[PDB]
Every structure is written in C-alpha cells, then in structure tokens.
Amino acid sequence: GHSKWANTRHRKAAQDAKRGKIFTKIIRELVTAAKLDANPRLRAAVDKALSNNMTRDTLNRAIARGANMETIIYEGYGPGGTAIMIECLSDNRNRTVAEVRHAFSKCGGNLGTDGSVAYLFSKKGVISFEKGDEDTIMEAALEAGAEDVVTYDDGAIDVYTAWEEMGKVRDALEAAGLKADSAEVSMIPSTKADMDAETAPKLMRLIDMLEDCDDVQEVYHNGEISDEVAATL
C-alpha cells in the first residue's frame, strides 16, 4: 500500500504555489556557492535549479555573482513522532532558530541536539523514474554504479547512488536510452514513521510553516504515508 506519489503528492502541490520563495532560495544557494567559488557545492545547486525549471542564463547570472550568509542545520520531532532535519542558509542565526522554533511550537514539536535524528538520515543521490521497465532500468543502474533500486506499487522507480555520483549514474542511464524523470540529492531516512489522517495534515502543516521561512533551504522527514490515508489530505 505504498506508492511514490503518496510521499510526494502533498507539499509538491504546495511548493508549486510558492515558486517565488523556491526560486529565490535556490538563487541564494547558487550565489553563495559561487562566492565561496567552491566547486562541489555549486554543482548541487545547479542541478536543483534545473530540476525546478530555472533557465540556464538565470543560473549563470546567479553564479556570475562570484552579504555573509552561513549554512546551519537543525533537528527535531513532529506529528506522529516523526523525525525531521532542517537545512538553512542565513546571515542571522538567532532569527533563523526562532522562526524554526516557532514552527514546532505551532505544531507541537521540539528541536534537539545536533546528532539526534540525524544518524537516521543518509545523504544520497536519487534518480527517479515515474514509469518504465524495472529489470532493464535496475541493471543499467547497478551497472553504472548505483547503490540500490526501489520499485514502488505505482511502478515508479528510485535509483539511489552515493550522493556524489548521482551525476555519473544519471548520465549513464541517459546515454543508455534510459532517461530519468528527475535526479536530485536528498536525505534518506532508514526508518518509517507511520501516519494517520490525524498526524499527517498536522505534519504537513509543519513542513509548510518551516518551508515558509526564507532561511529554510531544505526539510526532510520519515513520515511515511499510505495511499489509503494520502487520499484524505
């Protein structure tokens, strides 16, 4: 009872309503990495920009910006006792932590020590196929170096790679006539947080408030959902 759109339907139907905020968070992550100009920190941003439909000239002009903002991560728990990580970028640490702290209060939750639920998360590249031949994609993926392949109930396919190889793998599948629909780099949970029609929209409200903050670059969670309940939100 677990499809891919079930853990991507909601919020992804909300992030496509806050495109200004999403566009501009990417911009800051591009400019800051170019100002660094550090290389393997620009790459990530660029890929995120593409997957979000940001034109090339726009990204190039952002990087071509090569205001002291720093990166900061937070951790906590939320609806249904669901683990959560928050990645930020800001020039004001205290204002950032307050806004993040405010979200949890308004959603019954609490931040924690830097090492709490983090160990429950592994940073890896994910190349997704919304459809296709499973055994052919799997072999081409493992062949290219992939670390694992997941096939969901809706035929969607997720290829996991070492976070820093998502690119080589993605390209291999393409040159092989096996184009992925998306290929990003996220934080994958090694555990499941069951959710009901009660502790889901509640969690989803937290992700919404957190993502509403301009300092919040990334929000990850293990609140696995089911097709059964996903049809209540």
Curated annotation (Swiss-Prot):
<dbReference type="GO" id="GO:0003677">
    <property type="term" value="F:DNA binding"/>
</dbReference>
<keyword id="KW-0238">DNA-binding</keyword>
<dbReference type="Pfam" id="PF20772">
    <property type="entry name" value="TACO1_YebC_N"/>
</dbReference>
<dbReference type="InterPro" id="IPR017856">
    <property type="entry name" value="Integrase-like_N"/>
</dbReference>
<dbReference type="GO" id="GO:0005829">
    <property type="term" value="C:cytosol"/>
</dbReference>
<dbReference type="GO" id="GO:0006355">
    <property type="term" value="P:regulation of DNA-templated transcription"/>
</dbReference>
<feature type="region of interest" description="Disordered">
    <location>
        <begin position="1"/>
        <end position="18"/>
    </location>
</feature>
<dbReference type="InterPro" id="IPR049083">
    <property type="entry name" value="TACO1_YebC_N"/>
</dbReference>
<dbReference type="InterPro" id="IPR002876">
    <property type="entry name" value="Transcrip_reg_TACO1-like"/>
</dbReference>
<protein>
    <recommendedName>
        <fullName>Probable transcriptional regulatory protein YebC</fullName>
    </recommendedName>
</protein>
<dbReference type="Pfam" id="PF01709">
    <property type="entry name" value="Transcrip_reg"/>
</dbReference>
<keyword id="KW-0963">Cytoplasm</keyword>
<dbReference type="InterPro" id="IPR048300">
    <property type="entry name" value="TACO1_YebC-like_2nd/3rd_dom"/>
</dbReference>
<dbReference type="GO" id="GO:0010212">
    <property type="term" value="P:response to ionizing radiation"/>
</dbReference>
<keyword id="KW-0805">Transcription regulation</keyword>
<comment type="similarity">
    <text>Belongs to the TACO1 family.</text>
</comment>
<dbReference type="InterPro" id="IPR029072">
    <property type="entry name" value="YebC-like"/>
</dbReference>
<dbReference type="InterPro" id="IPR026564">
    <property type="entry name" value="Transcrip_reg_TACO1-like_dom3"/>
</dbReference>
<keyword id="KW-0804">Transcription</keyword>
